[PDB]
């Protein structure tokens, strides 16, 4: 409807989970320069959140940074339907949970090294550097 007069609280690069973000990019992404989140947990944490889906990554009230660091990380509460998921049943600690940013990188990790203690064939064929899904790959 117009060019919106963005004052500077347009602030021009952003930081969400230590893990970089850019600040005049159209949001749902930006939440996608991340691990473990991608335009589907992202278009829920914005609908269960009081959001814009067309705002940028710099243009962020902060009451919409800390509620959007927050649903994330929680999972079951602002209706997160649990099929929606990756840490689908822990199976070591159940649980209904989300594997995140720094954390999908050290849990990718801790799922291989409950089946390399074993000595089986879902994390021994990851072990020879060659693939486990059953195929003949030679070409690649």
């Amino acid at each position: 409807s117009l060019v919106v007069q963005e004052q500077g609280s347009f602030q021009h690069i952003l930081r969400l989970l230590n893990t970089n973000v850019d600040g005049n990019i159209k949001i749902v992404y930006a939440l996608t320069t991340i691990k473990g989140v991608g335009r589907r947990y992202s278009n829920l944490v914005c609908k269960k959140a009081d959001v814009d889906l067309h705002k940028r990554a710099g243009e962020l009230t902060q009451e919409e940074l800390e509620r959007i660091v927050q649903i994330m990380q929680n999972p079951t509460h602002y209706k997160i339907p649990a099929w929606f998921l990756n840490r689908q049943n822990d199976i070591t600690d159940g649980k209904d949970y989300h594997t995140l940013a720094n954390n999908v990188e050290s849990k990718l990790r801790d799922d291989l090294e409950r089946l390399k203690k074993i000595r089986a064939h879902r994390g021994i064929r990851h072990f020879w550097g060659l693939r486990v899904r059953g195929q003949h790959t030679k070409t690649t």
Partner: protein
Amino acid sequence: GVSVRDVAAQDFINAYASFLQRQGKLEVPGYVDIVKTSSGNEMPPQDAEGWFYKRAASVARHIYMRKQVGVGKLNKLYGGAKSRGVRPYKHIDASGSINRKVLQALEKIGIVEISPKGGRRISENGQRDLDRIAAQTLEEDE
């Protein structure tokens, strides 16, 4: 004298959509913002909204256009192919759910009805409510 046919295929869409947006009666089922409609769409509907009030004039104009049909029919219609990616592109039949529930909500007022043979037939009201509102969408064209 003044038809549903005599009028275009997205003005009736957006001018029954802002009729069934601004009716309140319409009910609005609980997996109708989130959940992906269709499974080859990644994107649900870009409205998230009262696609439900844009699927409430589609469905509905779509009935009346023919005899009868639905839910495993509005199942072959609303989707398209598949995004299989790499695998030469492939049809996928939606989710009977949302319109198995607008078809039991339209059942409510007197717009859509259950055609004997059975399954969705618009009533006798209903049509009354589409020839009132194909003549109120003919005068945004006139």
